[PDB]
Design a protein around this ligand. Structure first.
Ligand code: ADP
Ligand code: ADP
Ligand code: MG
Ligand code: MG
Lengths: 351, 355
């Protein structure tokens, strides 16, 4: 048979497993605490839903696996420094960055970057927006452990989701409009036909990247939409949240796409006929009333509900835009008030 | 939580389970062999993927549990006899029939029914199995074991076959999918095609018939009605008190799949009318191995049952759906060569419907 093991017990793994079953592919998602003896790792291909991991007996063994795809790619991506660096080596648009070592760097820093400064964690994610006077508002921890970027005034956020096969073939989904709030992805909108020039450009970028990396499987690229054009923000070496829509909006979902690649399967270009809307469910309980709207696709992760925690998502796709928008509106009252903003935002796209 | 136990380990149970997962509904498909203790039956809604079952300590337990939905409806449907009587009682159009009680009845039988005599087993006949097409000279060709255990219907000459899949909620509400065109070969379903917009009159008449049925039985869940298309109109062939192979296209071709729809019904979840925007085609994979090459075609949706491949056995299906019929048909072509010869007929047939 076809057998895969996924490093990580998360919802992504879950979704990957779900995607594989019908395909005859057996996915065994697995947590770091996992004993080597419980995983059939010795007989499968390995993938991961996580960028980095502790050194356990298992992870240790996976260190010498002739089948841990992209195993060595991770480390570069895992680190925001080397990542940013990667962009630089490729001559790909990105926000002016520096490593934040000394406090003895601040003056210049606020000099290079200007007014506002955005700081993030090199690893494990993680973002502080400081000004010339907030400078001591930050931990000393972040010294040579955090990066520093120019505050970017973008007009929109987009994400590019695609895959590269073992033969270098690549496929892409259309660009996805993303809405973050309090640094969390709240809402996504995907149009069957994105802006040609935008799409092309992004594809160029993502491809340069994946090939330079030698990357195999699905990877996502977060970008900013600027008057000066697109700028790469972040890279995710795995299926990404902003593509969850593909489960019901494309002929091949991302999870599927991933599996295909790593399992040496056909990687044709997925069909996308209609727009989709994804609603992230953050720290809310399941309201089966949502299921009254026929266009709604509930994806419940089955995790303990808790504040700020991603517990599921709602997938909405249809041919009728009216029907599509009416569903959204009807949703408002079925969701806690904090959801209203995103819903509306998405709604605004169909105007 | 939301927990469901399914009497039966088959592909249907599997698909129900898959369908439930993202909904937060745990489904436990149970093998007949299974020890009762081992099933979370006491704290779940019970359902079944089979019409009938042997007397096992397992079935004994389950069948007796007040949680078993439609438990009583089963016996009536499982027996072609009682099922036929039900159509009658409902005054629903169906092939003229009779119970084959005694040999000395043959003469009479041929009197009413005509030339061709289609004999069917009352119980246990899944894929045109225990069924005989006999003539006045062939009667001796039929097992004696059938006397009283089988019925006879008049050979029906139909333009085509269609199945209606729908559901009834605890609250009497009902939903339906568009009529599905079916192609049986060697008494086996090979292919189905659905159109977003079936024949209104035909669609409505079938629906009227399905409801009367479900209502009359107070059925709660997905049920499928097989009909023959004839000159006079539609005739009820068979009923399926459960998710049916002919509905497999709903998995990828409807906003709510028949699996999803069945779990919703039984757990008392909302049951709005599924949204169907395009046509779809389902291809049944019989006794054939998996060909991942099939996946070369972006519109193909593989459904592998993970069973042991055997001749005449249902190992999976291929769903194909799309707004662009040409793409659709061009896909179908592209598959012919990907499938073993026996498949070509179905395909072309399928193809034949878009033209
Ligand atoms: N340099 C920047 N200028 C403006 N906004 C930014 C900048 N960097 C990040 N953001 C904002 O922070 C969000 C999340 O930041 P990021 O660190 O890239 O992702 P994550 O928190 O998901 O790991 C962005 O998607 C955007 O709202
Ligand atoms: N009275 C009849 N006249 C003509 N064809 C019939 C008749 N009864 C059954 N058939 C044929 O046999 C097929 C399968 O038989 P059926 O008993 O209805 O289902 P199954 O054996 O699959 O449970 C039908 O789909 C049809 O092609
Ligand atoms: Mg982000
Ligand atoms: Mg039948």
């Amino acid at each position: 048979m076809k057998q895969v093991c996924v490093l990580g017990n998360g919802q992504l793994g879950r979704m990957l497993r779900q995607a594989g079953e019908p395909l005859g592919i057996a996915v065994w998602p697995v947590g770091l605490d996992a004993e080597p003896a419980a995983v059939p790792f010795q007989q499968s291909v390995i993938t991961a839903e996580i960028e980095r991991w502790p050194e356990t007996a298992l992870t240790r063994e996976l260190a010498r696996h002739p089948a841990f795809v992209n195993r060595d790619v991770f480390p570069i991506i895992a680190d925001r420094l080397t990542q940013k660096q990667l962009f630089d080596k490729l001559h790909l648009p990105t926000a002016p960055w520096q490593l934040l070592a000394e406090r003895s760097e601040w003056p210049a820093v606020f000099d290079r970057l200007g007014e506002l400064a955005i700081v993030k964690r090199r690893t494990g994610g993680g973002q502080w927006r400081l000004r010339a006077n907030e400078t001591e508002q930050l931990p000393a921890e972040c010294y040579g452990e955090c990066i520093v970027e120019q505050g970017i005034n973008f007009s929109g956020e987009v994400s590019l989701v695609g895959a590269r096969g073992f033969d270098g073939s690549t496929v892409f989904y259309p660009l996805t409009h993303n809405l973050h709030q309090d640094g969390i992805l709240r809402t996504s909108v995907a149009f069957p036909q994105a802006n040609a020039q935008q799409q092309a450009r992004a594809e160029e970028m993502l491809s340069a990247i994946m090939q330079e990396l030698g990357y195999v499987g699905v990877m996502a690229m977060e970008c900013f939409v600027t008057p000066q054009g697109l700028l790469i923000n972040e890279l995710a070496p795995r299926v990404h949240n902003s593509g969850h829509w593909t489960q019901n909006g494309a002929s091949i979902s991302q999870f599927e796409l991933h599996l295909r690649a790593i399992t040496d399967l056909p990687l044709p270009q997925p069909v996308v006929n209609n727009p989709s809307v994804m609603i992230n469910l953050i720290g809310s309980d399941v309201n089966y009333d949502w299921l009254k709207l026929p266009l709604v696709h509930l994806h419940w992760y089955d995790k303990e509900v808790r504040p700020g925690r991603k517990v599921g998502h709602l997938n909405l796709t249809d041919s009728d835009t009216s029907r599509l928008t009416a569903t959204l509106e009807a949703l408002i009252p079925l969701l806690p008030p904090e959801y209203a903003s995103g819903v509306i935002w998405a709604q605004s796209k169909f105007g």
